[PDB]
Design a protein around this ligand. Structure first.
Ligand SMILES: Cc1cn([C@H]2C[C@H](OP(=O)(O)O)[C@@H](COP(=O)(O)O)O2)c(=O)[nH]c1=O
Ligand SMILES: [Ca+2]
Length: 135
């Protein structure tokens, strides 16, 4: 897995954003996680949705460097969204969300599951600490 530079364009919510990747604006979706909905009517503004968006927005807006890391399988989902592990100043946002109890490990699709165990251990910790989603 290799990390590549990207430029934040706009943070949409806890797990989806728009970035300038390789000179082109694209919307990205975080691999292996699911933060609560704050859009889509068949979900509404779920609990912790606003929280995850806020946590995430601050983290990426104050970053000096953003990097995207694709896994080994497909690089985009059915909606044309890039699928990756995104780091803000070397810190993986995917794991950060899970450790704070603001997202759950979800959508695990082989072979795009390289960091699955790392994220599951962080979620377990969040669970035992009964953090946010886990309270
Ligand atoms: C994270 C991720 C999401 N998805 C799909 C599954 C879900 O499809 P449906 O929209 O058909 O439910 C949707 C979840 O994204 P959101 O959490 O942004 O809604 O995107 C993938 O296809 N691959 C992935 O690795
Ligand atoms: Ca979501």
């Amino acid at each position: 897995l290799h990390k590549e530079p990207a430029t934040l364009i706009k943070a949409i919510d806890g797990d989806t954003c728009k970035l300038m990747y390789k000179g082109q604006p694209m919307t990205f979706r975080l691999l292996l996680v699911d933060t609560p909905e704050t859009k889509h009517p068949k979900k509404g503004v779920e609990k912790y949705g606003p929280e995850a968006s806020a946590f995430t927005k601050k983290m990426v807006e104050n970053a000096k460097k953003i990097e995207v890391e694709f896994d080994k399988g497909q690089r985009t989902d059915k909606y044309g969204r890039g699928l990756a592990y995104i780091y803000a100043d070397g810190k993986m946002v995917n794991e950060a969300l899970v450790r704070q109890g603001l997202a759950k490990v979800a959508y695990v699709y082989k072979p795009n599951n390289t960091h699955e165990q790392h994220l599951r251990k962080s979620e377990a910790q969040a669970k035992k600490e009964k953090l946010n989603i886990w309270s």
